Amino acid sequence: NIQAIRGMNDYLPGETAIWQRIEGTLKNVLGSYGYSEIRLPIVEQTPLFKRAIGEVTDVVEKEMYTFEDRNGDSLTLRPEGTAGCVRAGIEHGLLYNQEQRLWYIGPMFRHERPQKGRYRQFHQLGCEVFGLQGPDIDAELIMLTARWWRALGISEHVTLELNSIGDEESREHFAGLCKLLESAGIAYTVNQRLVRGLDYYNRTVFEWVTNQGTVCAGGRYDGLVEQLGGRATPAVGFAMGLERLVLLVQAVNPEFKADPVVDIYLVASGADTQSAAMALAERLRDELPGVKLMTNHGGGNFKKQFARADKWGARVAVVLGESEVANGTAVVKDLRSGEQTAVAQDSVAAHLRTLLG
Amino acid sequence: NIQAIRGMNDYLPGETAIWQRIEGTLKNVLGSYGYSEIRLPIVEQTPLFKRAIGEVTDVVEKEMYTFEDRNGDSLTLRPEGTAGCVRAGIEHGLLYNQEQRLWYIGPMFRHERPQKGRYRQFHQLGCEVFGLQGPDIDAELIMLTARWWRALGISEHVTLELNSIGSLEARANYLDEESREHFAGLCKLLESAGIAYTVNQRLVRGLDYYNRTVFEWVTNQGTVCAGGRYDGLVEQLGGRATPAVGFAMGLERLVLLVQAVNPEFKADPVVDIYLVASGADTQSAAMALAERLRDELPGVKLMTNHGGGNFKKQFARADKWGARVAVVLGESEVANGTAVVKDLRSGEQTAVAQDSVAAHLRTLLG
Numbered sequence: 001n002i003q004a005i006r007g008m009n010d011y012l013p014g015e016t017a018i019w020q021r022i023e024g025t026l027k028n029v030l031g032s033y034g035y036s037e038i039r040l041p042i043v044e045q046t047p048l049f050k051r052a053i054g055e056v057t058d059v060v061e062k063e064m065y066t067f068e069d070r071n072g073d074s075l076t077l078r079p080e081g082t083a084g085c086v087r088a089g090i091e092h093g094l095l096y097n098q099e100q101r102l103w104y105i106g107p108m109f110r111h112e113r114p115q116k117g118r119y120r121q122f123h124q125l126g127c128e129v130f131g132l133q134g135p136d137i138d139a140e141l142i143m144l145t146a147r148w149w150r151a152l153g154i155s156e157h158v159t160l161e162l163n164s165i166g167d168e169e170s171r172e173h174f175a176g177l178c179k180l181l182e183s184a185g186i187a188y189t190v191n192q193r194l195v196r197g198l199d200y201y202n203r204t205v206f207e208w209v210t211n212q213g214t215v216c217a218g219g220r221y222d223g224l225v226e227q228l229g230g231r232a233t234p235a236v237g238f239a240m241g242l243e244r245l246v247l248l249v250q251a252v253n254p255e256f257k258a259d260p261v262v263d264i265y266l267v268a269s270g271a272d273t274q275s276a277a278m279a280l281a282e283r284l285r286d287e288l289p290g291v292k293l294m295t296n297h298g299g300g301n302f303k304k305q306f307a308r309a310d311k312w313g314a315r316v317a318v319v320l321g322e323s324e325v326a327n328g329t330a331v332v333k334d335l336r337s338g339e340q341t342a343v344a345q346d347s348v349a350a351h352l353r354t355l356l357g
Numbered sequence: 358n359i360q361a362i363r364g365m366n367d368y369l370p371g372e373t374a375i376w377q378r379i380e381g382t383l384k385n386v387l388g389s390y391g392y393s394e395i396r397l398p399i400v401e402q403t404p405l406f407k408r409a410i411g412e413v414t415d416v417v418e419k420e421m422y423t424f425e426d427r428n429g430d431s432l433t434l435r436p437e438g439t440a441g442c443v444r445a446g447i448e449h450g451l452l453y454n455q456e457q458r459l460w461y462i463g464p465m466f467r468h469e470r471p472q473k474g475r476y477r478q479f480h481q482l483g484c485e486v487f488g489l490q491g492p493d494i495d496a497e498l499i500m501l502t503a504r505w506w507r508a509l510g511i512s513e514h515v516t517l518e519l520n521s522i523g524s525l526e527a528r529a530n531y532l533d534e535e536s537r538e539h540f541a542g543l544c545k546l547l548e549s550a551g552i553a554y555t556v557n558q559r560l561v562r563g564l565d566y567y568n569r570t571v572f573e574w575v576t577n578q579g580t581v582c583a584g585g586r587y588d589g590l591v592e593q594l595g596g597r598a599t600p601a602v603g604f605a606m607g608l609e610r611l612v613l614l615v616q617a618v619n620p621e622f623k624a625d626p627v628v629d630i631y632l633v634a635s636g637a638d639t640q641s642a643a644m645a646l647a648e649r650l651r652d653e654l655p656g657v658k659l660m661t662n663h664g665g666g667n668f669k670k671q672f673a674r675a676d677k678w679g680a681r682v683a684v685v686l687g688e689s690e691v692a693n694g695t696a697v698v699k700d701l702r703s704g705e706q707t708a709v710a711q712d713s714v715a716a717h718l719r720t721l722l723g
């Protein structure tokens with residue numbers, strides 16, 4: 001058996017269920033603010049990360065996954081996604097004299113020693129807005145994170161740190177920023193030693209910390225579009241570690257369940273019943289949009305098939321043996337109470353609607 | 358300025374909206390069959406691919422992105438996802454004497470020459486079912502793909518090719534009665550469902566782990582979805598023998614095919630309401646009314662103008678985003694507790710009390 005590269009995790013069926021609920025919530029809250037999705041390559045050229053994050057940084061100094069391509073070109077698996085974003089923005093023409101409100105989700109890679117919060121393949125959701133300069137947009141992004149925390153019920157577990165690393169212009173801009181948050185009741189701490197670990201930020205720097213600590217981090221980087229070869233454009237954004245979010249919800253929120261995988265299990269036994277079973281299932285799929293129905297396969301006597309229905313968390317089992325098939329019926333069994341009734345096939349969909357919701 | 362690696366694409370805002378509409382439909386139809394999502398690493402050890410896919414195959418021979426790790430270990434960006442799936446299944450204990458019906462979505466990487474169907478970073482959605490043997494689950498998976506095509510409206514544009522390549526023994530003699538029975542049973546299930554298929558005897562797949570059922574859904578770079586059975590692979594990579602069947606589909610080729618054959622499969626506009634706001638110290642009021650209307654209209658796309666701009670600029674910005682309605686806020690509205698509601702489609706603008714704006718928008722949108 002081959003095993004997994006250390007620090008690269010698999011997310012098994014039970015836990016992805018939770019992952020899909022939290023992502024759906026996050027994308028919804030981004031949708032209500034009018035932010036569009038951009039999808040960017042996993043691999044970029046190594047000079048981008050060297051030129052944008054900075055040469056004397058732990059990321060470039062010791063963390064990147066770099067390798068030589070079949071044409072000599074060095075390629076690096078992205079360690080963060082902002083550089084890639086700016087790059088595509090410049091390349092495609094999306095940023096000059098334009099405003100963009102964007103978000104992205106995907107894997108990032110860093111060769112760090114794995115410990116509980118830190119991984120080699122980890123996933124980030126991040127936002128980047130281009131074209132807005134003043135403190136107002138920076139306050140809209142902090143308002144956006146605050147909403148996500150309310151929505152995931154973790155609000156009384158995340159602290160906001162802020163400060164400027166720029167200066168008159170930056171004293172004014174940071175102050176106006178601080179004024180917008182007071183006037184919204186967002187509680188923040190000005191922490192003068194909060195400099196971030198990447199060298200492209202300038203005025204606003206912030207971090208939402210829990211008590212590996214930082215759950216979300218971001219800031220402003222007004223110069224980076226020009227540095228990577230484009231026209232000067234103001235830009236701000238952040239990225240959050242979806243691994244640490246998932247962990248914090250699950251810990252602070254215990255009663256965060258997700259939807260079970262099967263609702264109705266199609267039990268079927270007897271000679272040549274399986275085409276009938278699969279045909280009934282396809283019809284019930286047409287009739288009950290968005291019902292998780294699973295067709296028993298590989299035989300098994302009724303006792304086995306009913307226990308399999310219990311394994312998946314089915315609430316109702318539709319049964320069919322030869323009799324049902326010849327008589328045009330289907331037996332509907334409410335697995336919660338045992339009450340089973342024979343219904344005509346034409347009427348089973350309505351009988352399930354009643355039993356499920 | 359740096360550019361993108363040749364054969365690796367960026368999907369910009371306009372096209373990603375189409376991409377989410379097609380993926381929601383696919384995931385919905387998989388959920389109706391009770392299929393669970395699994396998430397797997399993008400980099401695996403190189404021997405996995407060599408062992409599973411086969412040494413003398415074009416993927417191992419000339420396509421993989423391999424590189425050396427800081428400890429000597431050879432690592433390879435995955436070129437396909439089935440190997441990683443079985444590896445995780447065996448490593449975690451999911452497959453022995455169990456039934457799993459899984460799916461996965463993500464990037465695969467192959468060093469090959471850029472074409473219209475072929476890229477170097479591509480994305481697949483694939484399904485893996487473990488524990489079921491007979492032809493009936495193979496027929497469930499071909500039924501699942503047919504439903505997707507009806508749902509995406511591309512049904513009259515994709516053809517099904519099917520064939521059995523038997524077992525090692527029959528191949529090494531070169532199906533064999535057990536594979537003739539299994540295949541026949543499979544062809545019987547599809548005819549009884551009205552799924553039209555072609556038995557194409559030259560159809561062998563390009564990976565060497567497959568055994569009885571082999572199939573491809575082809576359009577007229579051709580193959581949009583491809584799969585087959587692989588009853589031995591779990592033991593080959595270290596686990597106990599378990600029957601397994603699955604497929605994978607090239608999401609780039611699907612998105613291309615829907616867009617072509619279904620010209621106006623249209624996506625969501627990304628803003629519904631634009632909040633216009635000018636005048637002295639209006640912006641905190643503007644951002645506060647925006648937050649409140651978000652609580653009051655769940656799932657409306659509302660964007661707050663920022664950076665000033667005169668009303669004329671701000672209304673044109675509303676047009677850029679496809680907003681239907683603009684809610685306006687000058688100094689006057691702030692003091693009088695109002696907000697102006699302007700129906701951008703007709704110009705009709707009324708002043709509404711801020712407590713009554715949400716209801717006025719509900720009426721105007723849907």
Ligand SMILES: Nc1ncnc2c1ncn2[C@@H]1O[C@H](COP(=O)(O)OC(=O)[C@@H](N)Cc2c[nH]c[nH+]2)[C@@H](O)[C@H]1O
Nearest residue numbers: 080082118119122214215217218219237238239240241
């Ligand atoms: N290894 C590892 N594991 C888990 N989570 C990890 C992680 N490395 C980072 N993170 C998470 O990501 C956020 C932010 O990471 P930083 O390296 O602190 O900063 C950035 O990536 C910037 N790109 C942010 C940005 C985007 N636009 C502007 N600025 C960590 O806090 C952690 O949760």
Ligand SMILES: Nc1ncnc2c1ncn2[C@@H]1O[C@H](COP(=O)(O)OC(=O)[C@@H](N)Cc2c[nH]c[nH+]2)[C@@H](O)[C@H]1O
Nearest residue numbers: 437439474475476479580581583584585603604605607
């Ligand atoms: N380069 C490139 N670009 C885009 N789409 C691409 C592509 N290379 C392949 N594809 C898409 O993937 C399917 C299948 O490709 P194959 O290399 O033929 O094989 C497989 O992936 C198997 N893993 C399938 C499987 C999974 N479980 C069981 N069997 C192509 O048809 C094309 O659409």
